[PDB]
């Protein structure tokens, strides 16, 4: 057997252009005119981008351009937007009723502005406090590039224990979102002055400090 | 769009069978056979394991079976093996131009007890409001297996605009942690009565509500 070749990664500058090559075999690609292209957004419910060599499905992003250059197929993305970061796959009909896929090309847009995160800290709410627990939530958001680190400050001494953070995910953007959580007993929470969520990103640091005077 | 409602997580053990399901909203159903199922491992290209409701392609192990009745196609891994563990998707060809995808699933071969998520909705802290910002967080924590559906609601009606959902992170107890957020204005927040964060894990829904109670 075999599964179509794709170049594992395809960069381009902003507003520019890239072309990915789904490359097959006489028995599949070049056998028939039935190559579709797929946009699989950083691990997501994938969509169809082309169906037959160069036909843009009923509501596609402006200028996905499909090519079949013998047994090499090509998808040309131009007017480069940030949102084109994805997993690009192709599929060609091979024989008896069935389709063959390709390796999988990750598309990379360059020239994306670096953004420093919006740290929103949270005090626990009444309900949680009634239910008898306290969990604090640092929300880091709209950052680029997606490397951030979260310290917790118990009260100006650190609190390594009871913290839990998340790997940054891409938004309907190409900005990331992350969060830390500190799980506390309410007791512990009446019992002392400040809590702090310190977030470092590309040199910057943003600290947010919360105090027990939450209203409800 | 994802008008093919697919479960968030589907899990079993070796030798236990698992149904994935794929529901259509589609004013379509009946006038239909063309429902194709895809087996997709993390790292690999997507590969079809079912075409036209019940036909697997060449080399699909016997255990995969598809069905469709009502508006529901179903895929039964009949006797679960290790690398049945993958992302699964479904499909429907509204002829040519309109290739509707389902939203995905996951096959978890459990080797950890099932953990239904802790939801913990936090409302626009008084400070953030004092900055004329509005954001409520839906912490989803301690869930296994690490796939979960998240949806929001204002005054009953669902909210789509402004919600960003992170990807399940593995925690220092091999259970999972996600977060959504709804970004708003004090206006929109204050101008309502109740906001649910609604979360779906396997065969479970947790809906937690926050009301605007406006201390400053």
């Amino acid at each position: 057997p075999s599964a179509l070749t794709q170049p594992p990664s395809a960069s381009g500058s902003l507003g520019q252009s890239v072309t990915i090559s789904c490359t097959g075999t006489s028995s599949d690609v070049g056998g028939y005119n039935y190559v579709s292209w797929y946009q699989q957004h950083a691990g997501k419910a994938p969509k169809v981008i082309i169906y037959e060599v160069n036909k843009r499905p009923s509501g596609v992003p402006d200028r996905f351009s499909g090519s079949k250059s013998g047994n090499t197929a090509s998808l040309t993305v131009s007017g480069l937007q940030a949102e084109d970061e994805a997993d690009y796959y192709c599929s060609s009909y091979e024989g008896s009723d069935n389709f063959v896929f390709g390796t999988g090309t990750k598309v990379t847009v360059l020239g994306q502005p670096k953004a420093n995160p919006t740290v929103t800290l949270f005090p626990p709410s009444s309900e949680e406090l009634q239910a008898n627990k306290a969990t604090l939530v640092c929300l880091i958001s709209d950052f680029y590039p997606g490397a951030v680190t979260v310290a917790w400050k118990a009260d100006g001494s650190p609190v390594k224990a009871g913290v839990e953070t998340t790997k940054p995910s891409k938004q309907s953007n190409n900005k990331y979102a992350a969060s830390s959580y500190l799980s506390l007993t309410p007791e512990q929470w009446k019992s002392h002055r400040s809590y702090s969520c310190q977030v470092t990103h590309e040199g910057s640091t943003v600290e947010k400090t919360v105090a027990p005077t939450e209203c409800s | 769009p994802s008008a093919l409602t697919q479960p968030p997580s589907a899990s079993g053990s070796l030798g236990q069978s698992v149904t994935i399901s794929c529901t259509g909203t589609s004013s379509d159903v009946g006038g239909y056979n063309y429902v194709s199922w895809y087996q997709q491992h993390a790292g690999k290209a997507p590969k079809v394991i079912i075409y036209e409701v019940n036909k697997r392609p060449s080399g699909v192990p016997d255990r995969f079976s598809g069905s469709k009745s009502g508006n529901t196609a179903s895929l039964t891994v009949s006797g679960l093996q290790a690398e049945d563990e993958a992302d699964y998707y479904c499909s429907s060809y509204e002829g040519s131009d309109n290739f509707v995808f389902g939203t995905g699933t996951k096959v978890t071969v459990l080797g950890q007890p099932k953990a239904n998520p802790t939801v913990t909705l936090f409302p626009p802290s008084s400070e953030e409001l004092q900055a004329n910002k509005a954001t409520l967080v839906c912490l989803i924590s301690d869930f296994y297996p690490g796939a979960v559906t998240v949806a929001w609601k204002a005054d009953g009606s669902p909210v789509k605009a402004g919600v960003e959902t992170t990807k399940p992170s593995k925690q220092s107890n091999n259970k999972y942690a996600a977060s959504s957020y709804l970004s708003l204005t004090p206006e929109q927040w204050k101008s309502h009565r109740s906001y649910s964060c609604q979360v779906t894990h396997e065969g479970s829904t947790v809906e937690k509500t926050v009301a605007p109670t406006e201390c400053s």
């Binding site: 039935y34 579709s36 169906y51 037959e52 599929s91 009909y93 009723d97 389709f99 | 063309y34 194709s36 079809v48 075409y51 499909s91 060809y93 040519s96 290739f99």
Partner: peptide
């Protein structure tokens, strides 16, 4: 993959 629909086609067919």
């Amino acid at each position: 993959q629909x086609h067919x």
